[model samples]
Target: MNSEVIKEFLEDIGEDYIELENEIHLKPEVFYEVWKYVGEPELKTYVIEDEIVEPGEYDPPEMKYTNVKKVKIKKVYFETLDNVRVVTDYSEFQKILKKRGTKLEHHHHHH
Candidate 1:
């Protein structure tokens, strides 16, 4: 999706820059990089699904939000000419990067 659409989606979920900062809070460049990573051309298309719950006399009902999308990662290889690397493990990479100071470097952006 385009930036406007992405912005709208984030707004729909109550995620503004300040909120985003409070959440991930990466540095401006890194934040932008993450956005770019998630919003890359190859990963633009997404599937949205919603489940509606009917209200009962004493039960609270709410709609469930779900979005499914496939992300494409470019391959990188250095060990050998035939070796290549493509990653779809965002959480893992985030954890590794976080431990490497990327998280702390951008912590100040939140406050």
Candidate 2:
């Protein structure tokens, strides 16, 4: 289930980073934590963001956009189509980070 999703995500991230089990995601952003195991204490990973999608309570099938005009939260801009606010998954959000993320901040463990 969820483990398969991570395997797919690491496949996309490259020939590295993986490992996870079922429990409860709760949030998409936390998905990046997997990077901590990417290269270990040498590669130096940085998960700018994991899942970033439209809030389930306010899906904008057509109203979705890059940025909301109110509180300033990123929206679908054309229908909710991301992995952020929802139950969260390693599918879409993983690629977007590759498509637009420019930050770096993860240190693999010695364990």
Candidate 3:
């Protein structure tokens, strides 16, 4: 399967980083680590807020106008690890990262 090529690419790109497989890593008692691979590109989005403002009538005159606060884009597909392709948005990706805590750090051990 061309998926093999995909694996090769992952390896090539991550060569500088650490690599692991289905194994438990341990430093002390009751400690271990697990690794899962996911792919994501430079992701971003825009937040837009809009409102209408009515002008109050004065001695002279008044007018109404619409205000645009901001403007942006805000998907999912299933694919296997060996060979797969998926499309998703920043929100969805954020959800996944939250679930995995891919960026969050937890400190529970005493030094």
lDDT of each: 0.36, 0.38, 0.35
**What is the C-alpha lDDT profile of model 1 across 19-65, one tens digit per residue?**
22212222333333444454322211222343444344444345653
Q: Which stretches of candidate 2 lie over 4 Å from their true place?
A: 1-22, 34-88, 101-111
Model 3: lDDT to the true structure: 0.35
Of 1 and 3, which scores higher on lDDT?
A: 1
Q: Comparing 1 and 3 by TM-score, which wins?
A: 3
Q: Can you write out model 3's per-residue Cα lDDT over 1-111, one digit (the tens) per residue?
A: 344443464457553212233221212111101112323222223443434454653555335544453434342222434424322344555566677676733552221
**lDDT-sorted candidate list, best first:** 2, 1, 3
What TM-score number comes out for model 1?
0.22
Per-residue lDDT tens digits for candidate 2, residues 1-111, read: 244555576578564432223222323344445533333122222233334554555555667565523333232101011221212343444555676673435642354
Models ranked on TM-score:
3, 1, 2
Model 3 segments more than 4 A misplaced: 1-62, 74-86, 104-111
Looking at model 3, residue 42 earns an lDDT score of 26
Clashing residue pairs in all predictions, respectively, total: 0, 10, 0
| Clash number for candidate 2 | 10
Q: After superposition, how far is residue 83 of candidate 3 from its true place, in Å?
A: 14
